[PDB]
Amino acid sequence: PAPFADFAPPVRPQSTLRRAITAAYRRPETECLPPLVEAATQSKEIRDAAASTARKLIEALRGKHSGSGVEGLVQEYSLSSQEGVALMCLAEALLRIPDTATRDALIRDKIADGNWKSHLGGSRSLFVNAATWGLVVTGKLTSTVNDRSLAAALTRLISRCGEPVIRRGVDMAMRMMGEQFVTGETIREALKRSKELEEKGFSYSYDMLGEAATTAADAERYYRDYESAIHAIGKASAGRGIYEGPGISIKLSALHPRYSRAQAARVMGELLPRVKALALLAKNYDIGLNIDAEEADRLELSLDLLEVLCLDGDLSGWNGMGFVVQAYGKRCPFVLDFIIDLARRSGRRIMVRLVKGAYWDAEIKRAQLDGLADFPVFTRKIHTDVSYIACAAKLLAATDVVFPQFATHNAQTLAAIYHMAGKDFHVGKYEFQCLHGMGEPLYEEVVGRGKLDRPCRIYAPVGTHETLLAYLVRRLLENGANSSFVHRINDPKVSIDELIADPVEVVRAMPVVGAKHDRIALPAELFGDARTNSAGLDLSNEETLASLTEALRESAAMKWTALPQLATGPAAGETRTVLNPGDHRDVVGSVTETSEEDARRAVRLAADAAPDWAAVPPSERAACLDRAAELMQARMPTLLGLIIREAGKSALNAIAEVREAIDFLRYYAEQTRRTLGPGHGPLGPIVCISPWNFPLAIFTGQIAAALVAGNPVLAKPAEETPLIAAEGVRILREAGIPASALQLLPGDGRVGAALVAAAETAGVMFTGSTEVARLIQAQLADRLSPAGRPIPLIAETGGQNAMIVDSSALAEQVVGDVITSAFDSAGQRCSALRVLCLQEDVADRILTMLKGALHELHIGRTDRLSVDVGPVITSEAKDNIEKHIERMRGLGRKVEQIGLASETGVGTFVPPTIIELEKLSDLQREVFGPVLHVIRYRRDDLDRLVDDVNATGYGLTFGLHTRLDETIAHVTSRIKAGNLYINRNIIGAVVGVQPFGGRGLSGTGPKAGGPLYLGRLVTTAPVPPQHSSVHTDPVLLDFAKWLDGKGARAEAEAARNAGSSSALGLDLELPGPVGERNLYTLHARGRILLVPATESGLYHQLAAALATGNSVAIDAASGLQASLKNLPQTVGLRVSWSKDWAADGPFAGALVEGDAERIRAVNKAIAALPGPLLLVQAASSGEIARNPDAYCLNWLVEEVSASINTAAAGGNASLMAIG
Ligand SMILES: Cc1cc2nc3c(=O)[nH]c(=O)nc-3n(C[C@H](O)[C@H](O)[C@H](O)COP(=O)(O)OP(=O)(O)OC[C@H]3O[C@@H](n4cnc5c(N)ncnc54)[C@H](O)[C@@H]3O)c2cc1C
Ligand SMILES: N[C@@H](CCC(=O)O)C(=O)O
């Protein structure tokens, strides 16, 4: 099959109307607003009449408004906010007891008289949904639950007020969850309760609350639920028709687990027939069937379903098909043009529900994460209001061919449209709509001859407690944010004049019409003045898909090559082809590999050229990196094609990798501009050995850092992926890196070994396996710099990454993050999820959902957008992974695998696999493939489990899914890993936002994409930006006092200076996208091995280690035991003496004192220690006397990155204030 010939063909050729939609997707806000203002303009007379009507409605709303039930309960029992939240959580839990008499007995006999804890909230915290009840009680969203505060509050309120307050809480929650948040628990109950307002002139559309199917079984459940509801609604409608009678609303995401543009062929083949069958049933009963609008990247896909349905002759004669359009979206007027034309062509009077939109804060976050040009929604609330009124004018001009349905709770919006529609009205011309239990106060001033005599359809949620709680936060934020009408009308500090303000005239009078909100960053400006964010590509945009298709095809027609590019020019060598891992018939290019002799020559040439590159000023070296970033951004589509075909990656992952390469270049450039001066001299020639799994990004990151720190580079790319490396070198050279400063040496591991062994090699940057890093460490321990000090090694070496999930996590969120973390990139990320740990009480349900989601993945050659998982890199990798799977299977462990299509046979594929283990110790080696292991744990054994995760010795990435603050605090304080992720996936660390790198068996540090990286690549490290701490280690202070008491005044002063200079305790938040908090902290590394030679050297080593929070093991062969007598117990607790260093590890670093040959000997003994590669610092006794910084404190602390998804509860609290 020709490369990319079937990458992403659209469902149908795009008409002129469809292209106008796509053209507006991310149109600048200043371009969108002027035509909306023009379309929304009304005469002065109408505006005065509309303001008068709006004032009348608002005066009625404020005149009949009473205090809510929850407020009256809080008042009656003098509850604090936390007590109110806790009470509603208890009431929710008591309502999970189905039998009434049993529940009432538990309240009277167990709950009221004392400890609620012994009787409820065991496997499941009482407070799982406290973020939701927090919104109900306080109006404020808090993303995680302080379950210790709520437990204290519940104990306090029960001990104070007893059974009467529990009774009132239960009755209140019963009413709210059975009658307010839903019209009824079941469609039959909802229908029964609908007759009252139908007799007053309201109508209904029932919302069955399903969305976001994760498995085929979920989708089938939502389908049969919609089918049964249509029968009930149609029986009840009893021939009333689509305007007077009730209808149903559906969400397409409920009806297929892979509802996305990437899976468009499956959507049209599998989802469409299901909608058609439901529509045929709605037709037979003559009821409305409305398609709800969801995320912006589903809008245009949903239009293809609407088109086919409206043109399908089997549905003719029925006008009940309906469709939502969101006015906060920039495409809205163009979507309406398309729908109105479709209604004309089909002869169907499409029911068009105009809404503002329910996903605003999620759309802001997604555009920022994806680095896109602009948002697909407005960023000022008043812009959405003008858009709404402009689109209403368009709909009101077309009431002969569509049925407009104006869904809004805003009385100003309502009044404007009521007067815009004019005097002639009949039922069927248009209607308003509102939400059950929210809009009735307003629309009881609208419906009926005694009011405005306009009808209103009530959108009526129907479902159980579990179903309604799933996305209730999103629903509450619709009317509960600071800019929301409903919130403002309940604000006594908001005047009626402010509420009837005309958005159209206010926008017109702004100095810059349509300006972006001042407090929302465009994705390109996420980092402000520090650096320019890389830009991505929108794979839901048909223009982008069409242009990418052509650029990818053109990339496959190119003759890609990689050569040994020495300072003197290209070199000759053995030449072989490079094959596509997904199809070995696809020759991607040719590589000429380096001889060991030319590798040694290249190091000599780099040493010769080192002074000339060091002499380029840091600002100009940084300018080279910035130029290279511009070139990679411009070349991204071609680079994507090469990464897809050479490395076996999906287009989605290739985009993210090119972004990361750009980000490394710009980040290390900025860090250079912040730090490097004449005193930060380069190490010398640096050997950069890069992996095949990130063959552009990690390749570029290591090289850019070394180059910009002033070092010439020997770049040794992975044997499997030389072509993208050669292209990266071409770009850096074009950007101004001299050929003598950057030499490319393709080949296997003996090229890397020859480079590492060369006498002029001054440092090594390695990313790859622990075994190979260990062999490199042994090579380097043979050598010293010309100054007689160890050759620095930065080695990043993988992990055995775990995710812990408790019973408070939302299963659908968990499963999405697990599927991504374990199987993205065929599990070939060092960050990938390897062990999922499920709390026993929820393990079976989550495992069922996970296996169902597994079988929805598409595996194949990655030149198709529909492929989720590509090949593994080689046949040897495939064989290694499959041997592990079969060993587990042979031991009797449950193995789940997806079936592979026959087309995979021409490449090297491993199917995504789930293996159920009894305990974590059952997994003994790192399996670098799409293989997820699952274990279960009892909640009381959580702390032991964290110990088990730490006990492996790895410490790279780690995930935690929980809503509970006590569990977050416990787990994050006890886990020892470099990159922590809370309520999100554990992959795709972002440069400068989640600096990446771990500890123990996972690496030496410093973190890539972090502020300590460049300092390792110069002889004297600079002070990184923001790198300081006001905290002083108390054991350091006790040691300094002990030194003073022994009379060692000089060393006591040096100890106090180390205490001040240490950055232990640094605690920063890094700028990033909204809806996420990204934290960066400095901790102690662990136990540092001290190898002293003199008394003063030992005191200096101890001061450095203690100032950075570490414990120490001191070499007993030093003979210096008598120098450390009578230590304070606080210091003694941190001090041990070691005769057998191998028995007393693992260590987290080392400090060595001695002459050059002593240092070399100790360096070899340290390399021989089993376990982690130690970051070793050495100094002579004279150097310790002369240089207070002989041992650099930068390398005695451990960096930790933590990324918290603060939108995980369903919305963004910070953005509730942005309008
Ligand atoms: C009957 C009915 C059916 C609905 N069905 C859907 C649906 O299928 N899909 C869907 O997405 N929504 C749907 N909604 C929700 C709806 O879109 C609104 O979120 C909600 O009703 C609030 O809008 P409002 O006009 O009633 O109030 P208003 O308070 O006047 O408006 C609030 C809205 O303003 C917008 N907004 C807030 N801040 C900003 C900002 N900084 N920049 C730009 N815009 C901003 C948001 O859209 C927000 O919801 C429906 C609402 C109703 C009444
Ligand atoms: N930085 C990558 C992993 C890099 C690697 O695999 O070595 C991530 O966070 O997904």
Coordinates of C-alpha atoms and ligand atoms in Angstrom, one line a residue, residues 660 691 693-694 698 767 796 828-832 928 956-957 981 986-990 996, ligand 2:
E660 CA 9.1 18.6 22.4
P691 CA 17.4 6.3 22.0
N693 CA 11.8 5.7 21.1
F694 CA 12.2 9.5 20.9
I698 CA 15.6 13.3 23.1
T767 CA 19.4 7.8 27.4
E796 CA 18.3 8.5 32.1
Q828 CA 7.7 2.2 24.2
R829 CA 8.0 5.2 26.6
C830 CA 10.2 5.0 29.6
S831 CA 7.3 6.8 31.3
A832 CA 4.8 4.2 30.3
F928 CA 9.4 -2.3 27.0
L956 CA 10.6 7.6 37.2
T957 CA 6.8 8.2 36.7
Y981 CA 0.8 12.8 38.2
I986 CA 1.6 9.7 33.4
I987 CA 3.1 10.3 29.9
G988 CA 4.1 13.2 27.8
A989 CA 6.0 15.3 30.2
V990 CA 6.2 18.9 28.9
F996 CA 11.5 15.0 33.3
Ligands
LIG2 N1 9.5 12.2 28.3 C1 8.7 11.1 27.8 C2 9.4 9.8 28.1 C3 10.8 9.9 27.6 C4 11.4 8.5 27.5 O1 10.7 7.5 27.1 O2 12.6 8.3 27.7 C5 7.3 11.1 28.5 O3 7.1 11.8 29.5 O4 6.4 10.4 28.0

